[PDB]
């Protein structure tokens, strides 16, 4: 089981690496209480590269 | 054995969740720190005055 975790971990790691942006924009939109698409996608492509 | 394999498997999901949650909060902070300006206070200070 430890060998399977060591071999499979990178496959889920690359999936969560893609979802961070969706979680960040939906969370910011909730906090702002108004639509954020017009001021968030240009932030995602410039900041997500550092995560 | 079997129960401990499930014990390790869920602990790994939680170790990842602890890092993804920090990144999602950092993402929301960077997004709001650029998306908020004078056009947001007329939709927030005005909202608080009714609360």
């Amino acid at each position: 089981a430890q060998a399977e975790i060591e071999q499979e971990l990178n496959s889920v790691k690359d999936a969560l690496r893609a979802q961070v942006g969706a979680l960040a924009v939906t969370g910011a939109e909730k906090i702002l209480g108004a639509s954020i698409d017009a001021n968030a996608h240009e932030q995602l492509v410039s900041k997500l590269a550092a995560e | 054995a079997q129960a401990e394999i499930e014990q390790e498997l869920n602990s790994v999901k939680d170790a990842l969740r602890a890092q993804v949650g920090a990144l999602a909060v950092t993402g929301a902070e960077k997004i709001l720190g650029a998306s908020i300006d004078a056009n947001a206070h007329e939709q927030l200070v005005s909202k608080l005055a009714a609360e």
């Binding site: 975790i5 499979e8 971990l9 496959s11 889920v12 999936a15 969560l16 979802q19 969706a22 979680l23 939906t26 969370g27 909730k30 906090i31 209480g33 | 129960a3 014990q7 498997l9 869920n10 602990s11 790994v12 999901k13 990842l16 969740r17 993804v20 949650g21 999602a24 608080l48 609360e51």
Partner: protein, 509 residues
Amino acid sequence: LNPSEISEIIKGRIEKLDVASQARNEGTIVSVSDGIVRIYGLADVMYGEMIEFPGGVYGMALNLEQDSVGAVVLGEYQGLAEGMNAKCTGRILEVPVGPELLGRVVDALGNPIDGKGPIDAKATDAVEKVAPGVIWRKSVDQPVQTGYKSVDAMIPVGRGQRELIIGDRQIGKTALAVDAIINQKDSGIKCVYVAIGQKQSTIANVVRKLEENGALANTIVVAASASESAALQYLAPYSGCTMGEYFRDRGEDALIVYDDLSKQAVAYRQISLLLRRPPGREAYPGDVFYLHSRLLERASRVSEEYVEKFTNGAVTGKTGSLTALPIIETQAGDVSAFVPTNVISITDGQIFLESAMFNSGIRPAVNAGISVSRVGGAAQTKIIKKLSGGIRTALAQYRELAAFAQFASDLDEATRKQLEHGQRVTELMKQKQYAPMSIAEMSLSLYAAERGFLQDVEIAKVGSFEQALISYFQREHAALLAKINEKGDFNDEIDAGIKAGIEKFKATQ
């Protein structure tokens, strides 16, 4: 290693964020010393209310002085500093409760420390509560078998009774309470073990022994180890009590062990001296009696009317109970100390463990003269009640007789009969650890002694005779043992059945 699942789990916390405004009462930290924090400005804080500090650290309000609030930290305090904001939650200290805690190890606040996942409990309850009043209770008349014949015959424990385990260091106090928890795996009684001020490796060894004996799935383990805040060690018995009370209030039976109330008293003395409250009899707080009396009066048996009222008619015709086994440590046998004096005066009985008997090889080490049960025969099944009547006081008189007749010349038949019988019952009361006996096994052992069958047996052979007799009845009389084990019933048919089996055993093996 499932993707998307982790995301939706996170989305579930983002979806339910409290985005609305809140009106709160607040203060500022003034000083941080030895787990104690002083605050200015908390005008609406209630006594014992939870205080919220930066970074999810929590405290509890204990001193509401006219110009300041004295709070104790429910975790590590070294991260707090002067000028930090202190907030107010309109909630009293609460912990999770329910059957989801069975087979889990948790901290004094109910957080899992076993790493076996989240506890999906569906109910929280207050840590500090008042016990059910005089009119809501019911008399104790149901047994709690510990599996030890010396305890179950001479110092019986009933469902809703409070029995103190007391002695010095390293003489079997934890072994007696853990074996009593192990014996409940088939009894239908839920168990709670509270560890106060113990080292974490000792707690892990008790949990390994519960799991190896199959008792962990029926037990809740509450841990407040030696490195944890004195506030968590002070609160742990009340948190464990609250988890046990969940079963009592719903028409079910529970058992709780407090491995060291003397360590809870030392943690309470520390907080009280650091809050600058004036000391008493051994630097202990004035209210150290009320610390233990408020805890121990919750362990009780409640009537059918109380359960019917608590469950809004969902449970009917059933009583509920919480039985307690508190442990106390003495220094060189000194019972005159303030804390031991208080607890012996609160419980429904006590079991005294003696170091001289323990060194002499009597390993359950129960002093029958000093130990006593205030419920007595009402806490025993019909068979054990009849076969054990007068054994405790007969052994107490044998110990005196053995010392009085030690150097005198040969005495009368009445004296020889009492002395020879007391020596055999003394050797019979010896038992090994992790080896409990059923009602039928204890009954055969008691019957062979009180009906005179051991009179021909040598003292050095009593253990071998008992082990062989049990093994023989288990192979040739299995249907009789199964009949005695249904409810512990007794009649002329069972009496004659046991007699015929013991006679055939001694005449042929």
